[PDB]
Every structure is written in structure tokens, then in C-alpha cells.
């Protein structure tokens, strides 16, 4: 941390404080952590099947299995960087709300 | 006999007469096809 690199992962979940905020210096337990209780982990193309007249649009997911985005996600940094345009036009606005 | 589709009361819907005579009134199908435009979005594997 003295020559600005970081150890860990990174966490995009929506925090809505009013208090005292560290993003460094995490107090207590993260969120959870890959392979947890309801966790998925993002397949490799970071795909996205689009669902029809109602439903919602579902992540592949490790495997080829289609897991809804509402939830918990493991994103490799890998798959962020060939997926960002399907990223921020689904996922992310899951973070926001 | 070109008109069993048209005059006989005993005519079977869809039954031709094609190896003798040439009915010339038959019951057909008319097939209102839609032919699909295939254009989706492209992904590829990431590194490791």
C-alpha cells in the first residue's frame, strides 16, 4: 500500500451511509466470499440470456447454468474486462437498486 | 369428374385423383411463413 498496489478483491455493493465511511480499512466481516452460502461465480464469456415477455434476464454462471442477477455474484477481473458492455447495461443497475 | 371437390358429397378433404385425371379443384393449404432475421450478441472467452 505504500507504492499504491492493493491486496484483495473489491466489493460493489450499494452503501448508503451517513456516518463514517473507510473504503480501505473494511471493519468487520466482508459481504461473502467466493464459493459461500449462495454465491455464484460468472462463467467465463460473462454471458447473458435475455429472457422474454416479462421475466428477467439471467447471468451464465459457472457452467452453463442460467442464474438470475438479483443475488450475489463473483466477477473475475478477467471476464469484467470482456464483459463491461453487458455489465453495466444489466448488472449494474441490480447494484444501484 | 375434373370437379369432385366442387359437385360430389363424398369427397375427402385433401384426396387427389393425380395418376388418372387432373382434379381441377382441390382442397389446399396456403402456408403464411415467417422467415427469421438472426442477429445476436457476440461474447468471447476471457484470459486464464
Known amino acids: ?97 | 369428374l375434373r370437379w369432385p371437390g366442387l359437385v360430389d358429397p363424398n369427397y375427402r378433404v385433401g384426396t387427389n385423383d393425380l395418376p388418372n385425371r387432373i382434379t381441377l379443384y382441390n382442397s389446399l393449404y396456403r402456408y403464411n411463413f415467417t422467415y427469421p432475421t438472426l442477429d445476436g450478441i457476440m461474447y468471447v472467452r476471457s484470459a486464464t
Open chain 1, 1 to 97: 500500500n505504500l507504492f499504491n498496489v492493493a491486496r484483495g478483491n473489491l466489493y460493489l455493493v450499494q452503501t448508503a451511509t451517513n456516518g463514517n465511511w473507510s473504503p480501505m480499512a473494511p471493519v468487520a466481516a466482508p459481504p461473502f466470499v467466493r464459493g459461500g452460502p449462495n454465491v455464484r461465480v460468472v462463467g467465463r464469456f460473462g454471458t447473458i440470456v435475455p429472457r422474454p415477455n416479462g421475466l428477467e434476464p439471467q447471468l451464465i454462471d459457472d457452467g452453463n447454468v442460467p442464474r438470475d442477477i438479483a443475488g450475489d455474484w463473483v466477477y473475475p477481473s478477467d471476464v469484467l474486462q470482456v464483459s463491461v458492455a453487458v455489465f453495466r447495461d444489466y448488472v449494474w443497475p441490480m447494484v444501484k437498486a
